[PDB]
Design an enzyme around this catalytic site. Structure first.
Site, short mmCIF file in Angstrom:
data_model
loop_
_atom_site.label_atom_id
_atom_site.label_comp_id
_atom_site.label_asym_id
_atom_site.label_seq_id
_atom_site.Cartn_x
_atom_site.Cartn_y
_atom_site.Cartn_z
N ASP A 133 0.90 5.15 -0.26
CA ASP A 133 0.17 6.42 -0.24
C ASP A 133 0.91 7.49 -1.02
O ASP A 133 2.06 7.78 -0.69
CB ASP A 133 0.07 6.89 1.20
CG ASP A 133 -0.84 6.05 1.99
OD1 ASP A 133 -1.97 5.81 1.52
OD2 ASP A 133 -0.50 5.57 3.08
N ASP B 58 -8.08 1.17 1.59
CA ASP B 58 -7.83 2.19 2.58
C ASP B 58 -8.77 3.41 2.64
O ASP B 58 -8.73 4.08 3.68
CB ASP B 58 -6.37 2.66 2.51
CG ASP B 58 -5.82 3.18 3.85
OD1 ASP B 58 -6.27 2.70 4.94
OD2 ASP B 58 -4.89 4.00 3.91
N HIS C 157 0.87 -1.18 0.00
CA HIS C 157 0.00 0.00 0.00
C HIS C 157 0.91 1.24 0.00
O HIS C 157 1.67 1.46 0.94
CB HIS C 157 -0.93 -0.02 1.20
CG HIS C 157 -1.88 1.13 1.21
ND1 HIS C 157 -2.87 1.30 0.25
CD2 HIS C 157 -1.99 2.17 2.06
CE1 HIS C 157 -3.57 2.39 0.56
NE2 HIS C 157 -3.05 2.95 1.64
N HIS D 121 -6.78 9.42 -0.80
CA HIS D 121 -7.45 9.36 0.50
C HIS D 121 -6.66 9.96 1.68
O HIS D 121 -7.17 9.89 2.81
CB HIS D 121 -7.89 7.91 0.79
CG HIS D 121 -6.76 6.94 0.82
ND1 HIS D 121 -6.31 6.27 -0.30
CD2 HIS D 121 -5.95 6.55 1.84
CE1 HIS D 121 -5.28 5.51 0.04
NE2 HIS D 121 -5.04 5.67 1.32
N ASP E 158 1.61 -1.41 4.44
CA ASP E 158 2.06 -0.11 3.95
C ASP E 158 3.52 -0.15 3.51
O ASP E 158 4.40 -0.56 4.28
CB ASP E 158 1.93 0.97 5.01
CG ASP E 158 0.50 1.35 5.28
OD1 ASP E 158 -0.44 0.75 4.77
OD2 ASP E 158 0.26 2.36 5.97
ZN LIG Z 1 -3.61 4.73 2.41
#
Ligand SMILES: [Zn+2]
Ligand SMILES: *[C@@H]1O[C@@H](CO)[C@@H](O)[C@H](O)[C@H]1NC(C)=O
Length: 1016
Positions: A63, A175, A61, A442, A312
């Protein structure tokens, strides 16, 4: 034949509003699965003839900004993950990996040498690396507008088609903080067949798991037939990390996260570490793991099991790739060779899982339930509802909607022509699309990133706004200059944009004054753009350096105008009051601009020595005790003064509004003979708990109901004009303004929470409307969903996203509040609406951000307030889960989200100027929009292609005949059409070749895309 979206209540197995009404939401300790129960299974369920097929799906994951910026994470983590994925997948042909975030993948790929680009293409082509969703980001689903969810999806998928030759048909959303049916809506119309979601309320997971309804056909709330349905898998457990994805007991699953043995600086919270798989332990380890898998499988209907394996920024270190792969390979070899388990386990991709599930379905092994509704508001545990991020960082939430419109307008204005490469149009548009797309992440629009990351997003969006301005103003010049005179310098500023509401009075002085004078410049051309496909009138305003200014159209017809002072509000640190000051050298001129569909209209502002015949001047009244004078230079009307008092105003034949002595609305009277309906604006504040969990960027944990803001004796300014009137009041933390132009009022709040720690400011409307516990809020600007306030849930659970509006109604009356920015809101009592304005929180709320929200800055929030009689409207029945706007409320929403654009000619004389563009464009029915118009080809392409996204909303029938309009055929908007095709919404697949090159209009609540091809 269009489906009726109003009168037929869909029959579905699970309807989320109905489920909510019945469910108890008790937070009981379910054992090792804390929020579930002790799962039991029959060992005899799987046998030689019926094995459990397990797909372990490695993932990471990533971000695009959160605790670090996009570029920081790319340099420190993601580039290493992707480079090591390439190496390890290439070297290990049975290993698999899924990737979601195309912003990062594009950033990586375009830095690869050709040798590595070819290796990367080969691992995608052979199915080892699989893209899931394929959007630029994994977007927020609460605050994002659907148009921007589509934009970012198209940005990522267009990149993948061009460079990787793949288009994902499975989506992965692990997420975002709660989930919206807008996603399956867009995905299903973009070629998708399956989707996966994770963050849903723990009570919902328990309820659906008990009924094996975690996989479902998710249809839209109004869809009777089911054609919108998209197969959806909801993950069952508290997180997407390895402890919560192998099975119900994290103390066991954590032992199968081989990155947690110590050398990587990770450990197991449950105090039992992973152990390296060996021959002397593999039988025992396999027993534990298969038992978890078989428990997880009990919650689903087929013999195909999904086991995500990731967390993550995982799969960075080479040593991490090895430790996870080799240990899992030893488990698979043992499990798969031991018949007693009746399991076949392997690394897989997401598509492989879904393909196998649907094979099982076709074999008649399973039937799946149908579901409609949404998955807000999320709570991950106890009373920790994630409704704070519906408001956090509201300056950037508002900026999202400004840039949304700017991108649409820049793409549309520039689509009309092919541009030489030297004009850099495609470059500037790609930058603007990508920055707006990035912010849909997000942790972007949600307001949940660290301060310096928020600064990065803001700087990127500012650059994007500048890019849009550049493209727009070059396009206006081209569209409105005689072709044999047009002589562009593609670097020059022919026009500047003038925006009255961004960043907004008291946010920034950025508004240019048009400087006129007898000894400098008598007149100035201004141009308005209308991105909507119907003729539109709207009042527009400009700052000018004289009050003696008149307006003409480009047939030199006088246009009625109103001049008002330029008022700015100041916190006077000396007198300790908030009060307005007027300019003595700059003035506002206001007039009604009339602009063609998807078109442009030019007007001229001219100075004179004295009051022009067709310009009127507003009166001004300052209500306060102890007034001091307010000189206004050459402004012809002196400011009047008075003690605070109730006042009434009416513009045109529009509503009459009554205000309290504090300058706040108290009533609306729709017509001369009608009643004064109580509608009372109030500002309140929520605080934070002194014991137990604290509010932060994600969570809203109020210390009880809101308390009224103490207003003191505020200064109220009343401006009364023929065209526009207003009441403005300087309250603590808010300059609140009600503006009247002859229809529904506009509200503007300049919100500056200042240094008020641990405070959330809410704006509430109190009415008589007998709404009970029902209210309606929108989802992504696309649809309105029925909400029911539940007293079995805490206050913060009754908060929902208000991405573009909300309403309450009874049999006779409706009050709709439209917004120009996504914020959180609710109806906490019958007849009330409220919407949060800003929040300033000292504490971290334990979700990984590691800071409070203390970086507030002044933001200008904008709204329209529409009070309507609805007793004659044909509305859905009481059991229908949707609601629908009236024409006036929809138009009000459009006035906020897609206003006219205003351009000021930069130089002294515009040679070759034309008066109008688009006068021959069809004026479409009011419920239809051209959401996107985008030229898809660069100038060297023989066959030019232009893509259009059409959307038709559904408006309430209330007995207004409102009839004669023109058919809009987007395929004939540009000349020399050679082909018209219906496509997916991303423009990436042709679905239908259209007879006669005519693009049909769409049904209510439908969206379609068309591409016209033109010989060039
Ligand atoms: Zn995230
Ligand atoms: C794109 O993928 C396939 C079509 O889905 C192939 O048939 C096509 O050749 C491919 N393009 C390539 C490999 O360049």
């Amino acid at each position: 034949q269009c489906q009726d979206v109003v009168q037929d209540v869909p029959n579905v197995d699970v309807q989320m509003l109905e489920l909510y009404d019945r469910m108890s939401f008790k937070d009981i300790d379910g054992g090792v699965w804390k929020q579930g129960w002790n799962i039991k299974y029959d060992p005899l369920k799987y046998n030689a003839h019926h094995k459990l097929k397990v797909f372990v799906v490695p993932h990471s994951h990533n971000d695009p900004g959160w605790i670090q910026t996009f570029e920081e994470y790319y340099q420190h983590d993601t580039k290493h993950i992707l480079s090591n994925a390439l190496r390890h997948l290439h070297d290990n042909p049975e290993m698999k990996f899924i990737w979601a975030e195309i912003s990062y993948f594009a950033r990586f790929y375009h830095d690869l040498g050709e040798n590595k680009k070819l290796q990367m293409k080969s691992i995608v082509k052979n199915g080892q690396l699989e893209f899931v969703t394929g959007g630029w980001v994994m977007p927020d689903e609460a605050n994002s507008h659907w148009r921007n969810v589509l934009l970012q999806l198209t940005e990522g998928q267009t990149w993948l088609k061009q460079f990787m030759n793949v288009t994902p048909t499975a989506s992965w959303a692990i997420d975002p903080f709660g989930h919206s049916p807008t996603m399956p809506y867009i995905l299903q119309k973009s070629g998708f067949k399956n989707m996966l979601i994770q963050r849903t309320h723990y009570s919902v997971k328990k309820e659906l798991a008990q009924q094996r309804q975690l996989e479902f056909l998710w249809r839209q709330i109004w869809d009777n037939k089911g054609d919108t349905a998209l197969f959806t898998h909801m993950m069952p457990f508290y997180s997407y990390d390895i402890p919560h994805t192998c099975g119900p007991d994290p103390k066991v699953c954590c032992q199968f996260d081989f990155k947690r043995m110590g050398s990587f600086g990770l450990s197991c919270p449950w105090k039992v570490p992973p152990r390296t798989i060996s021959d002397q332990n593999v039988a025992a380890r396999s027993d534990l793991l298969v038992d978890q898998w078989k428990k997880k499988a009990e919650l689903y209907r087929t013999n195909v099991l999904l086991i995500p394996l990731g967390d993550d920024f995982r799969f960075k270190q080479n040593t991490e790739w090895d430790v996870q792969r080799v240990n899992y390979e030893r488990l698979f070899e043992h499990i798969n060779s031991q018949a007693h388990f009746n399991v076949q386990a392997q690394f897989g991709t997401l598509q492989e899982y879904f393909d196998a599930v649907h094979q099982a379905e076709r074999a008649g092994q399973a039937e799946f339930p149908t579901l409609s509704g949404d998955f807000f508001t999320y709570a991950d545990r106890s009373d920790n509802y994630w409704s704070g991020y519906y408001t956090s960082r509201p300056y950037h939430k508002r900026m999202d909607r400004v840039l949304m419109h700017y991108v649409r307008a820049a793409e549309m204005l520039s689509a009309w022509h092919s541009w030489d490469g030297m004009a850099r149009i495609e470059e500037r548009l790609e930058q603007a699309r990508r920055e707006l797309s990035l912010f849909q992440h997000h942790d972007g629009i949600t307001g949940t990133a660290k301060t310096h990351v928020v600064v990065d997003y803001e700087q990127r969006m500012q650059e994007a706004l500048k890019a849009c301005q550049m493209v727009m103003q070059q396009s206006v010049y081209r569209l409105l200059t005689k072709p044999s005179i047009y002589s562009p310098d593609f670097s020059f500023s022919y026009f500047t944009l003038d925006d009255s509401r961004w960043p907004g009075s008291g946010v920034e002085d950025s508004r240019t004054t048009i400087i006129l004078g007898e000894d400098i410049l008598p007149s100035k051309h201004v141009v308005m753009h209308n991105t909507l496909p119907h003729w539109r009138e709207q009042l527009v305003d400009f700052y000018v350096s004289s009050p003696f200014v008149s307006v003409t159209d480009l047939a030199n017809n006088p246009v009625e105008a109103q001049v008002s002072p330029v008022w700015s509000w100041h916190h006077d640190t000396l007198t300790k009051t908030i009060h307005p000051q007027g300019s003595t050298t700059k003035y506002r001129i206001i007039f009604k601009a009339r602009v063609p569909p998807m078109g442009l209209a030019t007007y001229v502002l001219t100075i004179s020595d004295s009051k022009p015949e067709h310009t009127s001047y507003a009166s001004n009244l300052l209500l306060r005790k102890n007034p001091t004078s307010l000189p206004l230079g050459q402004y012809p009307e002196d400011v009047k003064f008075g003690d605070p008092r109730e006042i009434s105003l009416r513009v045109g034949n529009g509503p009459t509004l009554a205000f309290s002595e504090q300058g706040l609305l108290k009533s609306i009277q729709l017509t001369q003979d009608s009643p004064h309906v109580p509608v009372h604006f109030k500002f309140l504040k929520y605080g934070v708990r002194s014991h137990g969990d604290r509010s932060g960027a994600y969570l809203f944990l109020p210390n009880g109901p809101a308390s009224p803001v103490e207003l003191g004796q505020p200064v109220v300014l009343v401006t009364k004009g023929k065209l526009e009137s207003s009441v403005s009041v300087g309250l603590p933390s808010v300059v609140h303004q009600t503006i009247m132009r002859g229809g529904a009022p506009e509200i503007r709040n300049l919100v500056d929470i200042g240094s008020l720690d641990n405070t959330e400011i809410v704006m509430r409307l109190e009415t008589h409307i007998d709404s009970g516990d029902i209210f309606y809020t929108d989802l992504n600007g696309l649809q309105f969903i029925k909400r029911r306030r539940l007293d079995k849930l805490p206050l913060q659970a009754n908060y929902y996203p208000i991405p573009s509006g909300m309403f309450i109604e009874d049999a006779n009356t409706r009050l709709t509040l439209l917004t120009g920015q996504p914020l959180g809101g609710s109806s906490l009592a019958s007849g009330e609406l409220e919407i949060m304005q800003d929040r300033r929180l000292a504490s971290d709320d334990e979700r990984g951000l590691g800071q409070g929200v203390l970086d507030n800055k002044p933001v200008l929030h904008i709204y329209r307030l529409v009070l309507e009689k609805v007793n004659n409207c044909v509305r859905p029945s009481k059991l229908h889960p949707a609601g629908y706007l009236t024409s006036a409320a929809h138009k009000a929403s459009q006035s906020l989200l897609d206003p006219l654009d205003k351009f000021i000619f930069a130089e002294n004389e515009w040679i070759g100027a034309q008066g109008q563009f688009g006068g021959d464009h069809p004026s479409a029915r009011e419920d239809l929009d051209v959401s996107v118009m985008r030229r898809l080809t660069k100038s060297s392409a023989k066959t030019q292609r232009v893509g259009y996204v059409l959307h038709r909303t559904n408006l309430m029938q209330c007995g207004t005949p409102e009839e004669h309009t023109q058919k809009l055929d987007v395929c004939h908007l540009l000349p020399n059409v050679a082909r018209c095709e219906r496509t997916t919404l991303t423009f990436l697949q042709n679905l239908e070749h259209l007879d006669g090159m005519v693009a049909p209009e769409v049904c209510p609540m439908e969206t379609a895309a068309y591409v016209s091809s033109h010989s060039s």
